[PDB]
Structure formats: C-alpha cells, structure tokens
Design a protein around this ligand. Structure first.
Ligand SMILES: *[C@@H]1O[C@H](CO)[C@@H](O[C@@H]2O[C@H](CO)[C@@H](O[C@@H]3O[C@H](CO)[C@@H](O)[C@H](O)[C@@H]3O)[C@H](O)[C@H]2NC(C)=O)[C@H](O)[C@H]1NC(C)=O
Ligand SMILES: *[C@@H]1O[C@H](CO)[C@@H](O[C@@H]2O[C@H](CO)[C@@H](O[C@@H]3O[C@H](CO)[C@@H](O)[C@H](O)[C@@H]3O)[C@H](O)[C@H]2NC(C)=O)[C@H](O)[C@H]1NC(C)=O
Ligand SMILES: *[C@@H]1O[C@H](CO)[C@@H](O[C@@H]2O[C@H](CO)[C@@H](O[C@@H]3O[C@H](CO)[C@@H](O)[C@H](O)[C@@H]3O)[C@H](O)[C@H]2NC(C)=O)[C@H](O)[C@H]1NC(C)=O
Ligand SMILES: *[C@@H]1O[C@H](CO)[C@@H](O[C@@H]2O[C@H](CO)[C@@H](O)[C@H](O)[C@H]2NC(C)=O)[C@H](O)[C@H]1NC(C)=O
Ligand SMILES: *[C@@H]1O[C@H](CO)[C@@H](O[C@@H]2O[C@H](CO)[C@@H](O)[C@H](O)[C@H]2NC(C)=O)[C@H](O)[C@H]1NC(C)=O
Ligand SMILES: *[C@@H]1O[C@H](CO)[C@@H](O[C@@H]2O[C@H](CO)[C@@H](O)[C@H](O)[C@H]2NC(C)=O)[C@H](O)[C@H]1NC(C)=O
Ligand SMILES: *[C@@H]1O[C@H](CO)[C@@H](O)[C@H](O)[C@H]1NC(C)=O
Ligand SMILES: *[C@@H]1O[C@H](CO)[C@@H](O)[C@H](O)[C@H]1NC(C)=O
Ligand SMILES: *[C@@H]1O[C@H](CO)[C@@H](O)[C@H](O)[C@H]1NC(C)=O
Ligand SMILES: *[C@@H]1O[C@H](CO)[C@@H](O)[C@H](O)[C@H]1NC(C)=O
Ligand SMILES: *[C@@H]1O[C@H](CO)[C@@H](O)[C@H](O)[C@H]1NC(C)=O
Ligand SMILES: *[C@@H]1O[C@H](CO)[C@@H](O)[C@H](O)[C@H]1NC(C)=O
Ligand SMILES: *[C@@H]1O[C@H](CO)[C@@H](O)[C@H](O)[C@H]1NC(C)=O
Ligand SMILES: *[C@@H]1O[C@H](CO)[C@@H](O)[C@H](O)[C@H]1NC(C)=O
Ligand SMILES: *[C@@H]1O[C@H](CO)[C@@H](O)[C@H](O)[C@H]1NC(C)=O
Ligand SMILES: *[C@@H]1O[C@H](CO)[C@@H](O)[C@H](O)[C@H]1NC(C)=O
Ligand SMILES: *[C@@H]1O[C@H](CO)[C@@H](O)[C@H](O)[C@H]1NC(C)=O
Ligand SMILES: *[C@@H]1O[C@H](CO)[C@@H](O)[C@H](O)[C@H]1NC(C)=O
Lengths: 65, 165, 321, 321, 165, 65, 165, 321, 65
C-alpha cells in the first residue's frame, strides 16, 4: 500500500524528469519501464529506479520503444 | 575480434556501425540491449532483495563482573561483521565476473547473428566487421540489423563480386 | 559497404574488481555501499528521540536535578546519550541490575510518570525530604525527583508499611533505594535504630535488604552509599513495601508502554527538524542501498554494515575507447 | 538426408531461478527444501518421548499431583511440553536456577527415582506431611510427591540433621525447598521458633538459607512462598542437610544418566506409533534433503532450517518445446 | 543455433534426429548423456555433502532478569538463520547458473563433434542441422552418431553433389 | 555398516521398481548405477538415489548400458 | 580440439610446437603465459587478502551453574566454524572452476589467434594443429608465434598448393 | 610444415576438486590449508610464555607452595596450563568469580607482585601464620604465599582495620579469603567469637561476608572452607578492610599492566628456544596460509581454523599427458 | 615498514636461489617480478612469493623477460 504509493510518486517524478522514458507503470509487484532510448542518463535513471524498487518488493522490467 | 567500444554510439549498449553510398552512422540493436538491461536489473534485484533490512542493533552494557559475557557479545558482533563483509565482497566479485561475461557473450552473440544472416555474401574481417561483396543500400542495412536479411536476393551479385575479387 | 558489431563507450572512470581482474574500467556502475549521512539526529518516522543532554539512563530514570527537564517527556523513537553524559547517580552507590534496566528501557517507546506514593499523605509519620550535598542543584542541597528519602520524624522511625495496586493496563516500573550509612552515628541520627531492614515483595518478586555500615572512600564527598533497585509490576499485580529504616521510598513510577525499533545510542550530533527511516550515531541515512560502512549501531530500517570501503557492481560494459 | 543435434524436452512445469534469469522452466529439478511433515510426535530412533501432558519441567521434577503419572517414567528420547503446560509449582515461590535445571535435564535421557530419605524412619522426631490447599488434588489438600514438608512434632522442631552418601555410579539430582511464611504466627505454628535456618553442603556446594517473613500478594491463595533449590551430587560425593526449621526436605531424588541428542520442545501435536530420525514441534521429518523450512527447533539428525520458501536446483535441461 | 528441445526424444538428454531413404527417428548420444548425468550427480553430492546434519537445537529459557542474555541468544539465532538462508539461496542460484551453462556447453560440444566429423561433406544449417551432400544410409548415420564417420569414403560423392548444387 | 545396509536395501528396491536400470552396486563408498535408458522415470529415480546416498557418505556414478 | 598437454614444453604454460625443413621444437607464447600468471596471482591475492588474520581466540571457563552460557558460547563457536568451513570449501570449488575455465579460455584464444593470423593459408586440423599449404621457414614460424604473420606474402604459394591438393 | 597450439604438462600428481568434477589432476596447486606445526611451545614475538607447570590459574595467583617458582615471573606473552594442572586451591573452598578472574588475567601481559600489607607491621595485634595440612609443602604444613591467615593473638582477635591507597599507575589486583570453619569450636579457637564479619569496600566495591559454620564432607582432609574473593583497584582508588574475624588477609597484590593478544591455553607441549608469530596448544605455526586445521584455539596472528582436510586451489593447467 | 623490509629480504633470497628470475622489486605496495622463464621451479617460487606477499599488503605482478 504505502510502498506502492511511494513508488508511484517516484515513478511520476522520473517520468517527468527523464525525457528518454515514455512511461513508468507501477502495478502488481512489478514496475514496467517503457524507454525510448538507452543513454547514460536513461541507464542511470533506470538503475536508480531498480535500486529504489528493491526492498519495496517490486521487480523492474524494461521495454524499449 | 572487437577491440574497444565506440564513443560515438550514444544510444544503446550493443549495436551496429555501417557505411554505404547513401550514408553512415550508428544504431542500437534494440532486442539485445533490452535483454541485457533486463538481465542487469535482475542481477541488481537479486543482490538487493536477498539482503534483509538491518533493524535496530544498539549495543549492550556490561558491568565489571560480566567481562566474559561482554567478550562473547563482542565475539558475536565481530564474527557476524567478518562473515558479512566477506559475503558482500565475494558477492560483488562473483556478480561482476558474471556481468562482464554476460556482456561479452551478448556482443559475441550479436556478431554471430550478423554472420549467420550474411552467410558467404560478405567477407568476414577479424576485427568485428563484415564487408559486403554486393552493394548494400540502406534497406539492406536495416534488414541485416533487424535479422531479416534476404540472403538469396543478393546471392548472384555477391558471388559474382567474390569470384571477381 | 560494411557493417560492424561493437558496443558502447563513454568518458566514465568508474572502476570495479573481479577475481581475475582489478581496476576494470566500466561505462556505468552502482555503488552498493552507503558512506554519506546527514550528520544530524533526525525524527525517526516522524517522532523525535529522547535527548538525555547531560545525564545518562540512570540520572534520567532516577531523575537527578541536573536533567530535570526530561521529566516532561512522554514518548520518543529512540534514546540518545552523549559522550559527556556524566550526571548519573548523583549520590554514590551501586545501581543493581542497571544494565538489565537499560535493556528493558530500550524497548519502552512511551511512559506515564505518575506519583505512585503521594509525598504529603503516604508517609504521615515520617519525615519527607532528603536534600544531600552530593546532589547539589543551583547552589542548594537537593535530591532525586523520582525518589523520596524518608528519615525519622519527631524522634522515631515507625514501621513503614505501604503498597500499590497496579490499576494501569501497562507494566509499572518502580524504583527505590536502600541507604548504607558510613558509620553507626548516621544510622542512629536518621533512622533511630542500628539494625533496620527493607522488604519489597510482589507476586513475582521477593527481596529483603539490610544496611551495611562501614567507612568507605569518599565519592562525590560521601562516605555512604545508596543502592538502587527496581522491578516491573505486571498489569494486575500488587507491590508491597515494608521497612524498619534505610528506605529511600519510591515517589514517581513509570507506566511503561512497549514498542519495536527503539534503542539507546551514544551520539555527539545535534538534533534537527529532518525526518528519516534510518538513524546512526554519526547521522541519519537517506538511501536504499544494501550495505553501509558508516556505523555498526543503527536504529530503524538500515543497510547492513560492512567493513568494505567500496562495493561497486557492474551495470555496464567495459569502457575501452 | 540430414542429421540434427538437439536436446530433451517434456511436459514439465518445474521452474528455477538464476542470477540473470527468473522463472526458468526445466525438464527436471530437485527441491532441496523440505516443507512436509507427519504432523505427529514419533519415537525418535525407537524410543518414545517424555510427554508432560499437563505440567512443565518444574511440576514434573517436583512431582505435583496433577501429573503424578509421570513418576513411572524412566527413559525417553526427548521431553515434550504442551502450550497449556500450566501445572508447574503448585505452591507459589521462586524456583532458583530453574532455567539451569532445565538445561541440565535436557541431556539426561534416563533417571532412577529413588527414595533418598525414607519418610517413616528418616525424620522420627518431626511431623511428616505438608498438605496445602495450593496443591489441592482430587478435592483434598495435597503436596508434591518428590518433596516432604517437615513441621513441628509434639510441640517442637528439633535440629534437623541428615545426610546421603552417593552410592550410585551416576549423578544424583537432589531437590529441596525453604518455606517463607507470610507472618510470624505461621513461623511459630509450624516450626516453633522465629529465627530458623537451613544449611545444605556438599564437596562442591555450600549454601545457607534464611526464611523471610512478610505479607505478600496472594498467589493461588497463598501469602507465603517456597523457594525451590537443587544440586547435583558427583558419583562419589556426600550431601548433608541441617535445618533449624523452614526446610521442605527432599524425599525422592533422581540418579541421572546422560546422553546425546535429547532436548525439550513445546509441542501441540499428538503421539503416535511411527518412528523417525528427525523430530520438530510441528511433526516428524522423513526426508534426506539438506534444508527445511518447517521449524527452527529440531531434535535428531535434521535438515538445516532456512527462511526460504523454495530451493530448486536444476537436474535437467531448459524445457523449451 | 538449436532453438528449443525435442519432445519426441524420450531417451537421453542430448542426442540426434536423422532422416534418410531408409528411416528416421531420434537417438541419444550415450557418451555425452552419461557425462552430463555424472556431472549433475557430482553437483548434487557437492550440494548435500557440504551441508552438515543439523543436530538437536532446542531453545533456552531465561528469567525476567536475564533479558540481555536472552537477546544475545536470539541475536545469535537470527544471525545464523540469516547467514544460512543467504548461503542456501546464493548457492542455489550459483549452481543453477553453472548447471545451465554446463548443459548448453554439452549441446554445443556435441554440435561441434558432428561438425568435425562431417567436415565439408555436409551443408551446415544455422539451426543445429547438417545436410549431407552425399546420400547417408543407416550405416553412415550410425557412424556419425558414434564419432567414427568415414570422411574419405564419401568425399567424392559429396564434392560432386556440392559442385552440382 | 548400517548406512551401507540401508543403501543396499534401497538399491534393491530401486532395481526392482525401475525397469530401465540394470543394476545398482553399493560398494566401497560409491554406488555404481548401470542404466539401460535415460528417461524421465530413470532420471527421477537416479536423482532420488543420489539424494539418498548423500549424508550416507556414498557417491553415485552412472553407467549407460 | 587439443587433447592433452605436452610433457616436452618445459617453458611456459601455453605455447607452440612446430616443425619444418630447418628444425622443430617447442616455444612458449610469452604474452598469454604472462597474462595467465598475472590472473592466477590475482586469484591467489583475492583468496588470501579477503581472509582476515585470526587473532587470539582462547576459550572461556564456566562453572556448574553457567551451563546455558557455556552452551551458548559453544554454539557460537560451532556456528562460526561451520560457516567458515563451508565458506572455505565453497570458495575453493568456485575459484578452481574459474581458474580451469580461465586456462581453457586462454588455450582457445591462442588457437583463435593463430587461426586469424593464418586465414586460409593453412589447413585447419581438428586436433589443435595448422598445416601450412606454403612452406613455412623459421622466420615464418617466428612471425606466426609473435602475431605478425605476413599473410599476403605467402598467399600466392598457399593458394597454388591448396588448389593442387 | 605445421604449427600446433597446446599447453604444459608434467609428472605432477596434485589433485583438486570442482563442483562438476572431482580428483582433477593439475600441473601445480597451492595448498591453502596449514596442517603442520613445530610441536613445541615457542616465544611469541620474542617473549616467553608463563608456564604454570604444576598449578592452574588459581594456584598461581593465590601462590600455593607447589608452584612457588612462579612468584619470580613478571611478564609473558601467553599463559600455559597443562592437562595435569591439579594444584589449584590447596585448601578447599569456592573461588568466587574465578572464571571472571581468568578472563581478566588473560589480558594482563605483566604484573608487579608487591607486599600490599607488611606481615610484620600491618597486623601488630594479631597472629600472622596459617600453616595447614591441606597445603602441606615438603613434609610440613604451609599456606599460600600471597595470602596471610590471621588468627587470635594472646587470647583475642581485635577489630581488624586496614586500608591501602593505590599509588601505582596501574590497576592493583587484591585477593583475600573468608574462612568458614566446620564447627563452632574452630571459630572460638581461632577468632574467639562465634559471630564475626568481614567487610571490604572501595570506590566501586562494597561487600560484607559472614562465616557459615557447618559440618561438611572432607575435601583434602578439611571439613572447613575458605572462600576466595578478589577485586581490582582503579589507579587512584583506595580499598579498606574491616574484619571482626575469619579474614585471611591479603599479603601480596599484583599491579597489573594490560596488553593485547595474551591468552590462556591448556597445552601438553614442551618449551623451546624457537620464536613464532602464531601459537597453538599442539605447537607453533610457521606459515602464511589463510587456513589451518591444527587447533581451534590459537594465540597471535594465525590462519583461520576450518574442519577441512585439504584446500588446494589450482595454479596451473589440467595435467593430461 | 617492517613488512616491506621482510619482503625485501625474502625477495633477495628468492632472487639468489632461483636462477630463472631476473629481479624482484618490492616497492609501493606491489612486488614486480621479472622472470626469464616460466618453469615448474619458477612457478612454484612465484606462487610462494605471492602467498608471502598476501597478508603483508603487497600485490605481485609478473613480467616475462
Ligand atoms: C553533574 O555533572 C557535573 C560534571 O561531571 C558535575 O560537576 C563536576 O563535579 C565534580 C565532582 O564534584 C568536580 O570535580 C571535583 O572538583 C573539585 C574542585 O571543585 C575537586 O576538589 C575534586 O577533587 C573533584 O576534582 C568537577 O569539577 C565538576 N565539574 C563541573 C564542570 O562542574 C556535577 O557535580 C554533577 N551534578 C549532579 C547533581 O549530578
Ligand atoms: C493445575 O492447573 C489448572 C489450570 O491452570 C489449575 O486450575 C486453575 O486454577 C486457577 C487458580 O486457582 C483458577 O483460576 C481461579 O479461579 C477462581 C474461581 O474458581 C477465581 O476466583 C480466581 O480468581 C482464579 O481466576 C482456574 O479457574 C483453574 N482452572 C481450571 C480449569 O480448573 C489447577 O489449580 C492446577 N492445580 C495444581 C495442583 O497445579
Ligand atoms: C598438589 O597436587 C598433587 C597431585 O594432585 C597432590 O597430591 C595428591 O593428593 C591427593 C589428595 O591428598 C592424593 O590422593 C589421596 O591419597 C591418599 C593416600 O595417600 C588417600 O587416602 C586419599 O583418599 C586420596 O586418594 C594423591 O595420592 C596425591 N598424589 C600425589 C602424586 O602426591 C598434592 O597434595 C597437591 N599439593 C598441594 C599443596 O596443592
Ligand atoms: C588500482 O587499484 C589499486 C588498489 O585498489 C589502487 O591503489 C591506489 O594507487 C594509488 C597510486 O599508486 C595510491 O596513491 C593509493 O594509495 C592506492 N590505494 C590503495 C588503497 O592502495 C590504484 O589507484 C588503482 N589504479 C587505477 C589506475 O585504478
Ligand atoms: C514468476 O516468478 C514470480 C515470482 O517468483 C511469480 O510470482 C507470482 O505471480 C502470480 C501471478 O501474477 C501471483 O499470483 C503470485 O502471487 C506471485 N507470487 C509471488 C511470491 O510474488 C510468478 O508466478 C512467476 N511466473 C511464472 C510464469 O512462473
Ligand atoms: C578420488 O577422490 C576420492 C575422495 O576424495 C579418493 O578416495 C579415496 O580412495 C581410496 C581408494 O579407493 C581409499 O583408499 C581412500 O580411503 C579414499 N579416501 C576417502 C577420504 O574416501 C580417491 O582416492 C580419489 N582417487 C584418485 C585417483 O585420486
Ligand atoms: C562526458 O561527456 C559528456 C558528453 O559530451 C559531457 O556532457 C560530460 O561533461 C563529460 N564528462 C566528463 C567528466 O568529461
Ligand atoms: C499496614 O499493614 C496492615 C496489615 O498488617 C494493612 O492492613 C494496612 O493497610 C497497612 N497500612 C498501610 C498504610 O498500607
Ligand atoms: C563532538 O562535537 C563537538 C562540537 O561540535 C566537537 O568539538 C567534537 O570534536 C566532536 N567529537 C566527536 C568525536 O565527534
Ligand atoms: C534524501 O536526499 C534527497 C537528495 O538530497 C532529498 O531530495 C530527499 O528529500 C532526502 N530524503 C529524506 C527523507 O530526507
Ligand atoms: C506428461 O507426459 C506423459 C507422457 O505422455 C504422461 O504420461 C503424463 O501424464 C503427462 N503429464 C502431464 C502433467 O501432462
Ligand atoms: C547428627 O550429627 C552427628 C554429628 O554432629 C552425626 O554423627 C549423626 O549421624 C547425625 N544424625 C543423623 C541422623 O544423621
Ligand atoms: C492445538 O491443537 C488443538 C487440538 O487439535 C487445536 O484445536 C489448536 O488449534 C492447535 N493449536 C495450534 C497452535 O496448533
Ligand atoms: C517415509 O515416507 C515414505 C513414503 O510415505 C514411507 O514409505 C516410509 O516408510 C517413511 N519412513 C519413515 C521412517 O516413516
Ligand atoms: C619429475 O620430472 C623431473 C624432470 O625430469 C624430475 O627431476 C623429477 O624427479 C620428477 N619427479 C617425479 C616424482 O617423478
Ligand atoms: C582504624 O580506623 C580509624 C578510623 O576509624 C583510622 O583512622 C585508622 O587509621 C585505622 N587504623 C589503621 C591501622 O588503618
Ligand atoms: C602428553 O605428553 C606426554 C609426554 O610426552 C605423552 O606421554 C602423552 O601421550 C601426551 N598426551 C597428549 C594428549 O598429547
Ligand atoms: C619456518 O620454517 C622454515 C623452513 O623450515 C625456516 O627456515 C624458518 O626459519 C621458520 N621460521 C620460523 C619463524 O621459525
């Protein structure tokens, strides 16, 4: 509950800040990241998101648009 | 065969560099990059999930006649600290070796993908590059990058030029 | 026309280690070791800690004059002692099972400090006071706030006889002391009889104490001693006090709540308005990394402590321009 | 004409995990984690456990009336308490070093319960009895079976003076108690003197006990207390009892054998005729796997306990039809 | 190059599928299957032997004035439980990666075995199959499967048909 | 002694129950399994035998007839 | 493809064996041997450095009424001993697998180095040997061993003899 | 003309193990497990150990006659007891907190044995002696060297009253005893009063002792007991002794230095002139390997102890001629 | 200080005893070994030197002359 809400807020922040990411869908124990490009900025953001999801019980799967 | 990465390929981890009469540049191999990212995230989640959150671990006080108990407590603390430092550093080394082998295997698999697509229509250079015997326009490059290279379409021209060479 | 296969490279200088190789340069890496902190004490999940600024657990629970301000506290997330927490038992003596009391108090998270025995009415036939030079406060002799030193009144010390029935839903922490004068003249002056006893009993507690009179090296100017005792009443139990003398009666007692995650830490840092989910004596931690090398002792949900100085895992390719 | 190279596949749905990959489907796998059990108590290597059905270690060793049936037991493989083991010390008091006695008894594996002091002849000048309401049995006042409460006879309580020389090849566990009346009138009524002592000595034991008379909260209707003590005689040693009063003399003692693998467990399960090499409070384990997630506490040769929910290792190929 | 296993090969782990004018079917490669089974059993014995039998581990009781000792005992229990859960799960992951790499390497080695046996007498298809230029009867298939393929015996016919193709 | 006898009884049971196994020779610290086929049934039996031998001090070697 | 080592190559770990009309013998590949030795020393330093020195660890004495504390101390000792024996043996197994794979990879890389140097000027034998179509004198052997083989210099003769064969 | 690629082989028979493979033969290997030792006791970093040849810690610190030669020792690197260290407390009794004293002494590394109370002048009104058969030496009754048994002089035992002010820069270990006669006649004969007390106090120590007179099983021919006590004086503290009787006064005390790496080991081995950086009860270790399987208990900088019998890591190729 | 001096003495001993080694330079946390040949004797010496340097804080790098 609280973990999912915090991850949703963080995902909204990331989607706003990182223009190379299309969307970040937190749902049902996994975060689905739909990236448009894989650059240094995007990889750093995705690894930060993965570290954030861990210990919150969420796996991260990345799709390249 | 591939010596060093490309500083110009600003997009993707593994990809292609190509040049023909129409243009040149870099392009990422989306499928392999996606699989590599998913594997790396799996490694990160394995590293962090398998570690439990450390909860309150304040120390204890002992009086002057409880030296044995104090030393036993310190022994437990030091033993756990040694074991966990060893585990952390060994885990880091193991996962680093696994990850670097994973990246090398991905690059090798991409190279083999291109080779299987091209068969004998291109001269294999022992540096990670393939030289087409036939002229390869942008459509041909896109087909090769996407793994849909039409081998028989270029077979006649490739054989003619290979025999000429 | 040619097509080449290769991989990414950049101006990164991150370095990692393997079993075969060392100082491998990689395009990107994740540092699994947390080594930075706020450098402040923070509100752990929104609740401020108990700051024993000048006194330690003994002085706070016994309530010596030099940290009287702590008597207004009721709840906390953790207890903070400072490296200069000198003001413990202002009057010298052996705080019996004191470390066990620290262990018990580390998990309280809240108390109600209530007057277990009224000073005015509970001891009508005894002298209520106890100002001593060892606990001098603001230039005057004083005494603990949570203890009441009973002495002879009008030339006698009648048989003390009192009890408390625990009407709280919580455990009640009762603290008292037994006075051990330096010489028989102190015994006669204060309690009017050479051989007195103190007896404390409850459903799961049974002790009898006897004063031991002997000349001793002076500590804080006192050749006497006060041994400090304590016990917890179960929510429905009764505690009975009997004493022929030498009793330093309980005055205030703590109805203890219990919680999870609380602890006691010795810290030099300053308090601030920040919040945190992890706290260390050096400062709060604000990251979700698995490991940290800041301090062995942590409160809250914190990373595992290791002696390592760097734990970088590869999240990229070899960087070889 | 062609020849192809490939590998096996089947309709298996077993799944395993790696560092890179998760939910990998494999043709065959071995589950290294045991999660099933008989759900019963079993004979560990052919010997039935000691079932303390209604009473705990204290009640069994002191032999309170409510588990008198245990006095016929002589050997076991492990000791089983139940979550409702309420009948301990039927008369309130502090069982001194009781946890140490539990630790000692966890390794006995056999005893001989013999009458250390004959009731009829060992105390000719004292009253042998001790029925008390706190240990009421079957509607009548009663007392422990392994202890004998001595009181005044014909208006006096002469100096008690008895000893036992250990003629067994085994350690002898001797248990006794000291009575702490609630008021002086009980002391005079039972022992005819206000200040009595109990003294117990052996080659490696030296204690003196003094009754402490004080009004106390009633436990099981008693304002008095009996403190329970014990000691082990080395195979060749002698134990001597002296008492001016307040002694609850030893009546039966246990000549203890020693073994390996025995232990004490709190279990809700029922006994059955099955055999086992491993036992847990929830039930017996009947597999040779390396790990189990059934219960932390095990008796016998058991798998290592882990918090994992599944430990499957690959013993086959990737299943990819 | 081999995409997916065979549901029809009911015998053996790795093997061959073949077809000619005389028949078709599956057959296990006994040597490689035997070595794989022995390796898997070695892995299992390493996993189980290196774990010691857990002997009686009943808990201890502590009174109301031994809270520090009780917490130290619980700390030891929890620390050992954490360390052993971590060890068990990490060991499972490591041995699973090792075993899957082992199986993939075995399949690859079998493929290379066949390729070395056949040299240039068969067209290599990038899906794990070899097409003989010469007609390969049951005796030829058995020779290839057993690693005793008589290369020179078929060289003339294979070269003739390869040139014709 | 007892471990070897128990393994011998188990091996006899396996050889009776699993028709794809020729014999199971428990001897001198190792169990030699002579299998005729490697099917799902035989692999399951062999892995059960390997798990049984472990902690009894016996290694398992498999020969394919 | 390489079956067994050479008992005659008394110098170096990996190297070459060669024979021509001028002579024959063994020679070490200095670069690969040096890298292998450095890797092995890195493995050894990782194994030993990550283990801390064991300092004074004398046991404690307990009286007859401290059996619980004695058993807790023995429990701590046995748990740490089990954990460290497990760690030592597992580490040995892991590093042995890593080292043997490392040596096999080094040999394979050396073989690929020679193959890339020779291209199609030599017949590749599936036993770890290359047969030159052109005559290869001592200078040619030294060039091949040092990775400076002049491929075009021998192309005409190699093609002539390969076509003749 | 041909060029082949291959690898080294030799006549080595070293074997190693992997997860997949066992008994792999390799050209060269490093044994990470140390299993050889000098089989002697050695000078740890140049300083010889303290060899308690015939007596244990108790006998040495109390200084019983049978290891009087140890009274000339001042410094050591570690303490060595032998499996036959029988001569402890020559007079039977309970050495109180003896294990804690062993723990304290394990870290001393040096002491000065000085006469804390002069025998001739400190007790002018008491009899200084104490020869007892239990501590018989060389055919004559004797007594500890570091303790002084005070008894009545000229028909009385006046109130004992003495103190020592710690003028060392080091902690002073003070040992004393309290005599518990077997019968009241011994009490009257030695101390001339039935009810005597011993009182010992310091800034952080406060105990009172009372003799307990009772017939006991004979140990070493004595039906009495001497309980042995000890305490450490902080560098600036004072210790005060008062006794009405039953005191076995301190005679020599140890000004203790403190160090690192010292310990106590039970060893059967012989001393020799060799040096070492690591020592085990079986013998010294002289290698830099990470692991050893010689003995769990080590002193100095030693390898980690494991149960393994062989730990060989590959440092070469597979040996396959 | 003391560790480096002991390693220097050991390196001098090795350089004297092993004729296949050109020099052994202990300096700045690493020992640089300049070997002329890699034989069984030299490999044994180098591995002994590596084990000696470890726990003395020195890494070993080998150069082939
Ligand atoms: C609360 O804690 C403070 C700090 O520990 C106490 O003040 C300190 O008290 C000690 C002992 O009285 C002082 O040391 C003594 O100083 C006198 C000279 O004034 C000297 O003759 C003695 O030998 C001894 O050295 C110390 O100076 C003093 N420090 C300060 C900063 O005041 C205070 O007494 C404690 N009060 C309570 C109620 O706990
Ligand atoms: C053996 O154990 C049983 C179960 O614990 C004991 O029976 C229980 O005894 C308690 C205390 O006497 C009873 O509680 C009391 O009930 C009375 C009313 O009857 C009430 O006035 C008291 O305030 C208190 O609540 C409890 O009801 C009773 N339970 C049962 C099922 O009998 C028994 O006394 C023990 N006997 C021995 C010899 O150990
Ligand atoms: C120092 O240690 C030695 C060895 O422990 C002591 O000598 C031993 O003393 C015991 C007890 O006195 C002797 O056992 C007794 O022997 C007599 C017959 O002589 C017997 O009647 C008793 O029942 C008991 O068995 C033992 O024989 C003797 N051993 C030797 C080799 O002398 C010695 O007394 C100790 N002295 C001091 C000052 O600590
Ligand atoms: C290679 O790794 C080593 C050890 O991790 C690094 O060691 C440092 O080297 C510099 C330069 O000699 C010294 O100033 C430091 O004191 C060394 N640190 C330690 C902890 O020993 C070295 O810097 C790394 N080199 C590169 C290029 O990354
Ligand atoms: C993949 O693995 C995950 C985690 O091991 C499995 O998670 C379960 O997923 C189902 C379906 O969403 C849920 O109902 C369960 O609650 C999940 N369990 C847990 C523990 O999270 C998932 O089932 C696996 N998927 C496959 C196809 O094997
Ligand atoms: C293979 O490894 C095993 C176990 O490490 C070795 O077992 C020994 O075998 C011999 C011969 O049968 C016996 O005499 C020993 O008692 C066995 N030892 C143990 C500990 O079981 C075996 O020697 C090794 N074989 C080879 C060729 O190295
Ligand atoms: C690395 O390159 C990027 C892109 O040119 C640049 O923005 C960044 O400042 C560079 N960083 C460093 C440290 O040179
Ligand atoms: C004094 O003790 C009596 C019982 O002896 C009790 O009834 C009375 O309440 C006690 N007095 C007080 C003030 O508690
Ligand atoms: C503690 O804080 C004070 C005040 O900032 C500072 O002077 C002192 O150095 C600090 N000590 C430690 C150990 O942090
Ligand atoms: C953690 O640090 C970041 C960056 O400074 C900040 O934005 C965030 O508010 C911090 N979180 C907490 C709980 O202080
Ligand atoms: C798997 O296939 C076998 C063989 O056809 C069959 O006997 C078995 O019932 C099948 N199992 C499932 C779960 O479909
Ligand atoms: C009473 O004590 C005397 C010694 O004082 C002893 O001889 C006698 O045996 C004792 N009585 C009994 C019944 O043990
Ligand atoms: C204990 O057993 C009883 C009887 O079967 C059952 O009602 C109860 O739920 C059990 N409790 C537990 C915790 O197993
Ligand atoms: C273990 O379970 C199997 C299968 O139910 C059974 O045949 C065997 O007898 C059991 N073993 C024991 C010791 O109960
Ligand atoms: C191994 O071979 C070397 C070189 O010939 C020889 O010196 C040595 O003695 C041999 N060792 C054995 C054990 O045969
Ligand atoms: C005896 O005690 C008095 C104080 O009561 C003290 O002054 C005197 O020094 C003591 N005697 C000795 C010998 O210490
Ligand atoms: C102890 O040393 C003695 C004398 O060398 C010897 O007889 C005895 O066997 C040794 N015992 C042990 C356990 O080493
Ligand atoms: C260790 O053993 C070697 C070989 O016997 C010897 O030369 C050396 O002096 C020994 N070292 C010590 C400190 O005894």
């Amino acid at each position: 509950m609280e973990k999912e809400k915090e991850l949703k807020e963080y995902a909204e922040k990331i989607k706003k800040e990182i223009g190379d990411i299309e969307s970040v869908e937190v749902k049902d124990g996994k975060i689905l990241v739909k990236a448009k490009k894989i650059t240094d900025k995007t990889v750093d953001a995705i690894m930060k998101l993965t570290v954030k999801a861990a210990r919150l019980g969420f796996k991260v799967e990345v799709e390249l648009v | 065969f591939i010596e060093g990465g490309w500083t110009g390929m600003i997009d993707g981890w593994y990809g292609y560099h190509w040049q023909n009469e129409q243009g040149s540049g870099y392009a990422a191999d989306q499928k392999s990059t996606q699989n590599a990212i998913n594997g790396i995230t799996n490694i990160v989640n394995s590293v962090i999930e398998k570690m439990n959150t450390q909860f309150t671990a304040v120390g204890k006080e002992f009086n002057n006649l409880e030296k044995r108990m104090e030393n036993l407590n310190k022994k437990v603390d030091d033993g756990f600290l040694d074991i966990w430092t060893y585990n952390a550093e060994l885990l880091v080394l193991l996962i680093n070796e696994r990850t670097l082998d994973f990246h090398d295997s991905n690059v090798k698999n991409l190279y083999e993908k291109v080779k299987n697509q091209l068969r004998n229509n291109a001269k294999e250079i022992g540096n990670g590059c393939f030289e087409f015997y036939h002229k390869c326009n942008n459509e041909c490059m896109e087909s090769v990058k996407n793994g849909t290279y039409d081998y028989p379409k270029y077979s006649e021209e490739s054989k003619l030029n290979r025999e000429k060479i | 026309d040619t097509i080449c296969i290769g991989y990414h490279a950049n101006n990164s200088t991150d370095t990692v280690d393997t079993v075969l190789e060392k100082n491998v340069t990689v395009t990107h890496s994740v540092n699994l070791l947390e080594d930075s902190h706020n450098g402040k004490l923070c509100r752990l999940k929104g609740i401020a800690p108990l700051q024993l600024g000048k006194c330690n657990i003994a002085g706070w629970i016994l309530g010596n004059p030099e940290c009287e301000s702590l008597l207004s506290e009721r709840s906390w997330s953790y207890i903070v002692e400072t490296p200069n927490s000198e003001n413990g038992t202002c009057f010298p003596g052996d705080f019996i099972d004191y470390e066990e009391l620290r262990e018990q108090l580390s998990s309280v998270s809240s108390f109600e400090r209530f007057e277990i025995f009224s000073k005015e009415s509970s001891w009508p036939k005894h002298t209520t006071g106890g100002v001593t030079a060892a606990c001098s406060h603001a230039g005057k002799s004083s005494f603990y706030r949570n203890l009441l030193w009973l002495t002879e009144k009008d030339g006698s010390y009648p048989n003390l006889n009192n009890s408390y029935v625990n009407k709280k839903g919580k455990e009640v922490l009762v603290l008292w002391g037994v006075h051990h004068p330096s010489n028989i003249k102190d015994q006669q002056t204060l309690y009017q009889k050479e051989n007195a006893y103190v007896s404390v009993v409850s459903s799961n507690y049974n002790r009898r104490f006897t004063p031991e009179i002997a000349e001793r090296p002076k500590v804080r100017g006192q050749a006497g001693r006060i041994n400090y005792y304590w016990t917890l009443l179960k929510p429905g139990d009764t505690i009975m006090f009997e004493a022929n003398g030498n009793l330093i009666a309980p005055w205030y007692a703590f109805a203890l709540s219990r919680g999870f995650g609380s602890g006691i830490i010795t810290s030099n840092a300053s308090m601030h308005e920040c919040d945190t989910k992890c706290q260390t004596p050096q400062g709060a931690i604000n990251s979700s990394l698995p490991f940290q090398n800041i301090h062995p002792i942590t409160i809250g949900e914190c990373p595992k402590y290791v002696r390592s100085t760097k734990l970088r895992m590869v999240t990229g390719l070899r960087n070889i321009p």
